[PDB]
Amino acid sequence: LLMGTLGIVGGGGSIQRTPKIQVYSRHPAENGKSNFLNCYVSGFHPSDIEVDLLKNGERIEKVEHSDLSFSKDWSFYLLYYTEFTPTEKDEYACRVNHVTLSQPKIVKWDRSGSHSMRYFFTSVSRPGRGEPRFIAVGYVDDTQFVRFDSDAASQRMEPRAPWIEQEGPEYWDGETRKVKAHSQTHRVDLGTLRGAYNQSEAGSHTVQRMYGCDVGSDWRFLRGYHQYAYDGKDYIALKEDLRSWTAADMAAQTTKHKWEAAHVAEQLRAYLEGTCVEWLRRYLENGKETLQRTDAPKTHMTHHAVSDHEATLRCWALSFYPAEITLTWQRDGEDQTTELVETRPAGDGTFQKWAAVVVPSGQEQRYTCHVQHEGLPKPLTLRW
């Protein structure tokens, strides 16, 4: 459930992060067997990005993407995907263009616990091009359950997980009403923030917001969050105590004093400690077959002989939920700190990850990958 009201900021350049690009299949590739081709673009700012999936260099038509969301550092990520049947001679690729790149990048396809509810909000001003783009997504744990997109046709809060379709019309109209009121607050903040930083009225700027609550194994309140960023940088955040604010610069201190005087933090606290956990608990219960599950990792190892004197061992974990996982390489039983790819979505609710270690050639059997995950009945140890 969304928060019932949302206070505007007071009156007090944009960052550039280049996208990481991962091109891969949902399941292990087998020629003749249908699959999903994924292009995962992450770590980027600002949000405007172009992404195509290519078959023999030509743009594939039936291509969907995930709803825009972002990481703890405010950088965005999106999954583009298509159903496909691989063959030996068909070539697949992902083409990304972004303002941080001097040319289009083409990446070939080479082959017990706590719970949370989180909402993520992005508003992007588009001067001369109507009102700001507003995208809202709601999650329970690592599972998206709702979305709103101001450029989609319906102008409704929309379901994105079967279990939320249990809610009646009052729920859907109510969340639509409140999400539109969220978009209003953000649209106002954009104009106010431009003026606050003496910025050109012709440029595009970004407001991001994240709020929500954690519950423990007992399903009672643990922690609450409310965080706000302008142009991919911290502006103001509610402290752990839910009683005070951390302002990033002098312009945000003005919002701090306004929000202190209007008792905003205390209105936030009632939602975060009350409404937020009540509805979290209710969602956990209504979707328990979906949400109260673990999917164990399916693990294997690959060996890439790079030189005459070294080799790289890649340890894989596939099709696991939730996303939290630990892969570590050991050298003769002692741990060894390698590269670690961003945990990427498979596209079906599950996740993928690998950890690689560069080892001297002829000492393969010396190393072992260890895989710790909530859904394994016991830990796994892989060897070569």
The string of DSSP codes covering 149-184 is ETTSSS-S-EE-SGGGGGS-HHHHHHHHHHHHHHHH
Q: Å resolution of this model?
A: 2.2
- Find the helix packing angle between 169-196 and 250-261, rounded to 10°: 130
Closest by CA to 225, choosing from 124, 121, 149, 143, is: 121
100 and 119 fall within a common domain: no
Q: Taking the CA atoms of 215, 220, 221 and 223 in sequence, report the sign of the dihedral they define.
A: negative
Give the position of tokens 């077959």.
289
Residue 8 within any structural domain of the chain: no
Q: 112, 141, 169: which is the final residue of a domain?
A: 112
173 and 50 fall within a common domain: no
26 and 89 fall within a common domain: yes
Q: 277, 293, 309: which is the final residue of a domain?
A: 293
Method: X-ray
State which residues form the domain around 50: 15-112
311 and 261 fall within a common domain: no
Residue 69 within any structural domain of the chain: yes
Which tokens hold the place of 40?
């995962």
To which H or E segment does residue 51 belong? Answer: strand 50-55
CB 19 within 8 A of CB 44: yes
DSSP letter (8 states) at residue 199: -
Residue 75 phi/psi, 5-degree rounding, is: -75, 145
267 and 306 fall within a common domain: no
Instruction: Find residue 19's DSSP bridge partners.
Output: none
Q: 263, 293, 323: which is the final residue of a domain?
A: 293
Which tokens hold the place of 31?
């020629």
Return d(Cα 254, Cα 59) in angstroms, integer: 49
CB 361 within 8 A of CB 305: yes
Residue 317 within any structural domain of the chain: yes
Return d(Cα 198, Cα 193) in angstroms, integer: 9
Instruction: Find residue 158's DSSP bridge partners.
Output: 147
Residue 4 within any structural domain of the chain: no
What is the chain's percent helix, strand, coil content, to nearest 5?
20, 40, 40
Give the pairing of strands 367-372 and 92-97.
Answer: unpaired
**Exposure of 140 in the CB half-sphere (CA atoms within 13 A):** 27
- Give residue 149's identity as a one-letter amino acid code: D
- Give residue 41's identity as a one-letter amino acid code: V
88 and 129 fall within a common domain: no
The CATH number of the domain holding residue 189 is 3.30.500.10
To which H or E segment does residue 255 belong? Answer: helix 250-261
Those residues whose C-beta lies under 8 Å from the C-beta of residue 93, and which sit 6 or more positions away, are 23, 53, 54, 57, 106, 107, 108, 109
Residue 264 within any structural domain of the chain: yes
107 and 122 fall within a common domain: no
CB 139 within 8 A of CB 2: no
135 and 273 fall within a common domain: yes
- Give residue 37's identity as a one-letter amino acid code: L
38 and 87 fall within a common domain: yes
Return d(Cα 15, Cα 98) in angstroms, integer: 13
Return d(Cα 60, Cα 67) in angstroms, integer: 19
CB 259 within 8 A of CB 265: yes
40 and 59 fall within a common domain: yes
230 and 96 fall within a common domain: no
DSSP letter (8 states) at residue 200: -
Return d(Cα 147, Cα 131) in angstroms, integer: 19
Return d(Cα 145, Cα 119) in angstroms, integer: 10
To which H or E segment does residue 187 belong? Answer: helix 169-196
Please count the structural domains in the chain.
3
Q: Taking the CA atoms of 3, 64, 47 and 325 in sequence, report the sign of the dihedral they define.
A: positive
CB 208 within 8 A of CB 29: no
Return d(Cα 264, Cα 143) in angstroms, integer: 29
264 and 171 fall within a common domain: yes
Residue 30 within any structural domain of the chain: yes
- Give residue 365's identity as a one-letter amino acid code: Q
Instruction: Please report the DSSP string for 259-304 in residue order.
Output: HHHTTHHHHHHHIIIIIHHHHHHHHHHHTHHHHS--BPPEEEEEEE
Residue 5 within any structural domain of the chain: no
* Distance from the first to the final alpha carbon of the chain: 49
Residue 271 CB neighbours (<10 A):
23
Q: What angle is formed at CA 3 by the lines to CA 231 and CA 152, rounded to 5 degrees?
A: 65
58-59 β-sheet, strand order: 58-59, 50-55, 92-97, 105-108
Residue 204 CB neighbours (<10 A):
17
The CATH number of the domain holding residue 302 is 2.60.40.10
Q: 321 to each of 31, 70, 291, 349, how far by Cα in Å?
A: 27, 19, 10, 7
Nearest-10 Cα torsion for 133, 182, 120, 241? 150
Return d(Cα 384, Cα 380) in angstroms, integer: 14
Residue 9 within any structural domain of the chain: no
Those residues whose C-beta lies under 8 Å from the C-beta of residue 207, and which sit 6 or more positions away, are 121, 122, 123, 124, 186, 189, 190, 193, 228, 229, 230
